Structures are given as C-alpha cells and as structure tokens.
C-alpha cells in the first residue's frame, strides 16, 4: 500500500464566470467523465468531475452577489459504480444528477431537490425539476459552503465518484479582521477512498458476509475508505510559510467522521462553523468532523519553521484507527520562504453573538432516529418512522422559529442536516434507551449539557450522539418552498433517512 506524503496538495483553481456584470455573475459547470492520478504510484483513475476536475473548481462569491450557475450533465448513460435498483421505486435514466449547494440560502427550485434531477442535456428530468440555471443570491453570512450531487437514490454514488467542490462566501465587512487571506487561505476537502491496484475506484457492491438473500448490487449502511485524500490526492503534503494560514476544512466523505489533531501537539484556532464566523475564536487541540461539517481554522506555523507536522486522526471507521493509514490525513512542511511580512491576525472578537436577537418559539418538533428492516434483512434508517415518499410532516411557517428535539436511540451518531437554514445548538442530554424502545417513553439519565464552544455559533449539520436528545433552534426563511432534511451520512441518506421539509406561507 501507498507511501504517505509524496504528492503535493492540489489547490483547485477558482472558477471564472462565463459572464459578469455589476448586476449578475453567470457560471457554467458541466459534469464530465475524467481521469486523474490520485497518487505518485497509482495508474490514473476514471472519475466524474465538475468541469472534468476532482475536486470541482472552487467557487468564490461575495455576500449578496447575484449568482447564477448552470449545472449541466455530460455524463455517460451508464454508471461505473454499483447501483442498487431495489431501494426506491419507479422508465427513468440510470444516471441522474442534481447539484446541491450545501449551506446555501437558496430558493427552493435552485436547492437541488433529490427529485429535481436531470440526465444528459436535461433530456429527462425528475418530477420536481423546474430550471436549468440555478440562482444563488448569497444573502447570508460569509462562510464555507460546498457543492455536490444530491440525486435521489444515487447520492452516495455520485459523490463518491468525485462530484464535490468548495464554494466560499466572502463578506467584505469581515476584511477588517485581517484574517489570513489569498494564498494563505486554503480549502481542504477530505474524502476517504478505496482504490484498486489498476487505479479504479472501489465502492462495495454488497456488505460484509453477503447473505445470499440480498440483491446484487446491495446498498450498505456504511462506507469506510482504506485511504484518505485531501483535495483529490492520497496523503499529500503541503509546503507552507512559517506564518498564519486559514484553512476551510470540509468533510466530503460518505460516512467517515474524522477527529483531527496535529502530531506535535500544537493548537488549532477555530474561527468559523458551517454557518460562518463564531462570535469568539476558540483554541483547540483537536476537533470532531462528521460528514458535511465544516470547520474554518487558523494554524499558526510561525514558530515551527523547518518542521513536518502531521494532521492526524484518532477516530476509527468500522474499527480502531490504523496508525499507518487512516490515522494520517496530510503533512505540513514549514519550508516555504515568507513571500512578505505576515500582516494577518487571529482575533478573539469575531462577530456579533447569535442571541443578539430575541426569537419566539412557534413550535417544538420531536423527532426520532429509528429504522425498520426490509424485505431482504437490511436495516432501513428512517426519520420519525416515515419514508421519503410519505406525506410531508415537517411543515414550519416561514418567518418563525422552532425548536427541534432529535432523539437518537441508535448505537451510532448521526450528523443531521437541514437545508436552507442554519441554526443554534441548545443542548444534549442522555436517556434510558431500552425504556424508550420498550414503551416510547423518554426518561433523562443526567442533566442537559450545553454545546462546546465550537457549536455556539451557527450550524447546519450537527452530530446527534447515541443515547442522547439534541435540541436545536432554527428560524425558517427567508424563502418558502419545498426543501429537505436528512442524515449527512450518504449511505443513510439514500435508504432512507431523508424527508421533505415544507416551509409554508399564507
Ligand atoms: Cu444541504
Ligand atoms: Cu450535503
Ligand atoms: Cu445516519
Ligand atoms: Cu442535503
């Protein structure tokens, strides 16, 4: 297996507009079969990429920039990854695609609804499709967003194939904080993969111990890659200057949760969560990062000139972490000479607090993380006992604020994500699990615990741990329409831990 730290980290180019005016910015991105080398010692890999790139081009926008992206499909009619035709019921094309701007404050027909998919040149289109050219008005806080495929029953596959990319919102009012910028502001999209000797992607076509019950192919409830990539390279190194850098850390992995640290025991400074700048910077030695979460951090290399510091990982996936493989993410080498004085800062005071506003509670939704079992013996994961196709039940009123109480009686954590909104985190609290499943009755086995400082700002994707109740608060708006919410573990999302979320007007 593969030598760590032999390839330089790619930094995806910033996409140039096809057309741009003071009034609007117009982009085109076309999904393409392409080939790229993921490691010095691998034959080139066949992948699917936005504009033929893996990752996709980084998109950079200003707050309130009036942006249009025409997302196009120029992919083969047949997939190269194992499709399990038994998981959702229809004839439709095999390959369907739709692009979701994760974290985007987006009108509903531009949010990438799972059933607004389209095939090559939009020849066929799912029943919720309305438009070719998506509109992102970016009337939101500066933040790290990312874009990826969201097609019904295909998300885990189309993302694994390479359909991911970063999208950054710059709010000019933050410039005065003098945070590291430009070359010193670098996205890190982390994706675990398993790669065959011939260089092709491997994604499992059935679980461990294929019971000869199951279909072929069969969806699996979890995927753990043998290798870790950052920005499309296996275990890369990045040469940095001895100074402060900002990194936009994005977990673009299907299932895997990371728990990140530096091997010299040095510290990160977190300045931002999914929803933007935290009110105050937080010094951390480590942090958890589940699928779809984003951490905006500063790493201060000033005193570590000449050193090699590994970005390490302690969280296992399907087993204890292996020191020689998945315990490693990437390696910094502090050997780039300074291009100029480091005029960047690491302030304490970042932004006005979340409860700067008084909201009033319209509704309290109690939501259970559960899971029946299917025809073939496989676990099916469900939000509050509903399938995706059942009539909508999460129906908040535009303009109003709800508390959502997520109850997780399962043995694992679920990163729950809501489209459109970001939200504050209130608390987590433990409970009698056997009692909850035996009777449907909820008894707390300890006090409510507030979030850690990492989670005191704005979030859109949030870890709900086993045996706990998580409470979040969201004001739903500013758009009304048809959106979704789901577990961000893609293997779960596709079967069937995803439900519609209607935000109503009258
Ligand atoms: Cu999203
Ligand atoms: Cu997503
Ligand atoms: Cu899940
Ligand atoms: Cu989603």
From Swiss-Prot:
Stored Pfam families: Cu-oxidase (PF00394), Cu-oxidase_2 (PF07731), Cu-oxidase_3 (PF07732)
Cofactor: binding comment: Binds 4 copper ions per subunit. The 4 copper centers adopt structures classified as type 1, type 2 and type 3.
Span of domain Plastocyanin-like: 44-80, 96-173, 235-313, 373-504
InterPro entries xrefs: Cu-oxidase-like_N, Cu-oxidase_2nd, Cu-oxidase_C, Cu-oxidase_fam, Cupredoxin
GO biological process, one term: sporulation resulting in formation of a cellular spore
Cofactors demanded by this protein: Cu(2+)
UniProt: Cu cation 1 binding residues: 100, 417
Site, Plays a crucial role in the protonation steps: residue positions: 111, 493
Catalytic activity: 4 hydroquinone + O2 = 4 benzosemiquinone + 2 H2O; 2 (4Z,15Z)-bilirubin IXalpha + O2 = 2 biliverdin IXalpha + 2 H2O
Description of what induces expression: Expression is switched on about four to five hours after the onset of sporulation, a time that corresponds approximately to the stage of spore coat synthesis and deposition.
Known outcome of mutating residue 475 to A: Retains approximately 60% of the wild-type activity with both ABTS and SGZ
EC number of the protein: 1.10.3.2, 1.3.3.5
UniProt keywords, alphabetically: Copper, Metal-binding, Oxidoreductase, Repeat, Sporulation
Subcellular location: Spore coat
Effect of residue 111 to L: 9-fold decrease in catalytic efficiency with ABTS as substrate. Almost loss of activity with 2,6-DMP as substrate
GO cellular component: outer membrane-bounded periplasmic space
Binding site for Cu cation 2: 102, 148, 488
Tree of life domain: Bacteria
Annotated Cu cation 3 binding sites: 150, 419, 486
Effect of residue 471 to K: Retains approximately 20% of the wild-type activity with both ABTS and SGZ
Temperature notes for this entry: Highly thermostable. Optimum temperature is 45 degrees Celsius for SGZ oxidation. Optimum temperature is 75 degrees Celsius with ABTS as substrate.
Impact reported for residue 497 to L: Loss of laccase activity. Mutant fails to develop the dark brown phenotype typical of the wild type strain
Quaternary organization: Monomer.
Family: Belongs to the multicopper oxidase family.
Protein name, per record: Laccase
């Amino acid at each position: 297996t593969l030598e760590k730290f032999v390839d330089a980290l790619p930094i995806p180019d910033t996409l140039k507009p096809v057309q741009q005016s003071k009034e609007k910015t117009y982009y085109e991105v076309t999904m393409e079969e392409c080939t790229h080398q993921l490691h010095r010692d691998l034959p080139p890999t066949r992948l699917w990429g936005y504009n033929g790139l893996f990752p996709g081009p980084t998109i950079e926008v200003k707050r309130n920039e009036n942006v249009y992206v025409k997302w196009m499909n120029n992919l083969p009619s047949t997939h190269f990854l194992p499709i399990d035709h038994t998981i959702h019921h229809s004839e439709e094309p095999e390959v369907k695609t739709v692009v979701h701007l994760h974290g985007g404050v987006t009108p509903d027909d531009s949010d990438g609804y799972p059933e607004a998919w389209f095939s090559k040149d939009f020849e066929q289109t799912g029943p919720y499709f309305k438009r070719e050219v998506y509109h992102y008005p970016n009337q939101q806080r500066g933040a790290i967003l990312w874009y990826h495929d969201h097609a019904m029953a295909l998300t885990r596959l189309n993302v694994y194939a390479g359909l991911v990319g970063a999208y950054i919102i710059h709010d000019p009012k933050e410039k005065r904080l003098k945070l590291p910028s430009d070359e010193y502001d670098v996205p890190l999209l982390i994706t675990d993969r398993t790669i065959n000797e011939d260089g092709s992607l491997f994604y499992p076509s059935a679980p461990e111990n294929p019971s000869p019950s199951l279909p072929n192919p069969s969806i699996v409830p979890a995927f753990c890659g043998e290798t870790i990539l950052v920005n499309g390279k296996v275990w890369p190194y990045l040469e940095v200057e001895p100074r402060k850098y900002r990194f936009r850390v994005i977990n673009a992995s299907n299932t895997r949760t990371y728990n990140l640290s530096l091997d010299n025991g040095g510290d990160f400074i977190q300045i931002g969560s999914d929803g933007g700048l935290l009110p105050r910077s937080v010094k951390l030695n480590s942090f958890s990062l589940a699928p779809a979460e984003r951490y905006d951090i500063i790493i201060d290399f000033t005193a570590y000139e000449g050193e090699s510091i590994i970005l390490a990982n302690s969280a296992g996936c399907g087993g204890d972490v292996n020191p020689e493989t998945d315990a490693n993410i990437m390696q910094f080498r502090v050997t780039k000479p300074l291009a100029q004085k480091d005029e960047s800062r690491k302030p304490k005071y970042l932004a006005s607090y979340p409860s700067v506003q008084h909201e009033r509670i319209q509704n309290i939704r109690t939501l259970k993380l559960a899971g029946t079992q299917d025809e073939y013996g496989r676990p099916v994961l469900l939000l509050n006992n509903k399938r995706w196709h059942d009539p909508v039940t999460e129906t908040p009123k535009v303009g109003t604020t709800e508390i959502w109480s997520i109850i997780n009686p399962t043995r694992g954590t679920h990163p729950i994500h809501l489209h459109l909104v970001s939200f504050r985190v209130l608390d987590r609290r433990p409970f009698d699990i056997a009692r909850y499943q035996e009777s449907g009755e909820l008894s707390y086995t300890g006090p409510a615990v507030p979030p850690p400082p990492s989670e005191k700002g704005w979030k859109d994707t949030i870890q709900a741990h086993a045996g706990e109740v998580l409470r979040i608060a969201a004001t739903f708006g500013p758009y009304s329409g048809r959106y979704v919410w789901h577990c961000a573990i893609l293997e779960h999302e596709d079967y069937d831990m995803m439900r519609p979320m209607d935000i109503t007007d009258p």
